[PDB]
Amino acid sequence: AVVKCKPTSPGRRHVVKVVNPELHKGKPFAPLLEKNSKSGGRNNNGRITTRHIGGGHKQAYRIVDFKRNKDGIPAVVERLEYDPNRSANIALVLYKDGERRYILAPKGLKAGDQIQSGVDAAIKPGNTLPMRNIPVGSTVHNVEMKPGKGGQLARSAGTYVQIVARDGAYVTLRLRSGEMRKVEADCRATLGEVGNAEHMLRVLGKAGAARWRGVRPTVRGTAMNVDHPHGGGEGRNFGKHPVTPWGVQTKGKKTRSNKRTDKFIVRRRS
């Protein structure tokens, strides 16, 4: 639930938490865990490729199954769990054969609900079927863009895409960004929405709350000397067009220079 803390101290006035008693108050399933060494925004060369990244709280990787290729075997939800590697919560399921796996937790899922993957599955949240069998005008998540590789769209907290049409071997979708894309009509998609919608109402309330996530502080550039176009000056001058480091606009300039697909795009956005 979305709860507002009390201002007993500076650092708790504007903080807002998202707690859920339905989550597992213990350790997760170990066989589905693996190391996750932090990077710091650096690469194999040791250079900072992405800034504002470093430190934070340790994490272990929850092996998630975005493919959902176990068809013809129902599984029931054992327990919900909190995943640090992502914003949404996951769910530990148990397959009749004794196989346990993690999946994204949809909107209205609990511990004990049944779900199944495949073309012969039922139309209920949590089930995975190819969009060829999914009706038109529905709401799905963890959508696949190529059959066999795994869901890649609508994997976030409260994200969901809506199927808009299906002409042939392709189906048109309106992604959460407002984009109207079309993918093959054989890509597996999951029914329902990822349930953490209140995740966006969360509020850090203090700086250190961001440093736990691994986010390092951000320095603007206006008072930045040889180091950034904006640079400096006696006072707050900034008498030039807003520009990135390395010299690009950042306030309207489109940088889509792929031009490979150019087919699935219909209503890019806005």
By CB under 7 A, the residues from 177 to 236 that bind RNA are 177, 179, 181, 184, 196-200, 202-213, 215-232, 236
Which residue, 95 or 130, has its beta carbon nearer to RNA? 95
What is the rounded end-to-end Cα distance, in angstroms, of the chain?
32
Query: Which one of residues 112, 135, 137, 263 is an interface residue with RNA (CB under 7 A)?
Result: 263
Query: Which one of residues 80, 92, 109, 154 is an interface residue with RNA (CB under 7 A)?
Result: 154
For residues 140 and 134, the answer to whether their CB atoms sit within 8 Å is yes
Could you tell me the two tokens for 116? 């199944």
Task: Give dist(CA 92, CA 76) in Å, integer.
Answer: 9
Q: Please report, as residue ranges, which positions from 41 to 60 form the binding site for RNA (by CB under 7 A).
A: 41-60
Query: What single-letter amino acid sits at 93?
Result: V
Q: Single out the residue of 107, 120, 57 nearest to residue 80, CA to CA.
A: 107
Task: Give dist(CA 128, CA 107) in Å, integer.
Answer: 15
Which residue, 48 or 111, has its beta carbon nearer to RNA? 48
By rule CB under 7 A, what string of x and - marks binding of each residue 3-42 to RNA?
---xxxxxxxxxx-x-x---xxxxxx-xx-xxxxx-x-xx
Which residue, 135 or 259, has its beta carbon nearer to RNA? 259
Query: Which one of residues 112, 135, 137, 252 is an interface residue with RNA (CB under 7 A)?
Result: 252
Could you tell me the two tokens for 145? 């863009």
- State in angstroms the smallest separation of the CB of 209 from RNA: 5
- State in angstroms the smallest separation of the CB of 267 from RNA: 11
Q: Please report, as residue ranges, which positions from 116 to 145 form the binding site for RNA (by CB under 7 A).
A: 145
For residue 168, what is the DSSP state? S
For residue 89, what is the DSSP state? -
Task: Give dist(CA 78, CA 33) in Å, integer.
Answer: 17
**Is residue 114 close enough to count as binding RNA by CB under 7 A?**
no
Which residue, 44 or 135, has its beta carbon nearer to RNA? 44
Helices (H), 25-75: none
Task: Tell me, by CB under 7 A, how many residues bind RNA.
Answer: 153
In the three-class reduction of DSSP (H, G, I as helix; E, B as strand; rest coil), residue 182 is classed as: strand
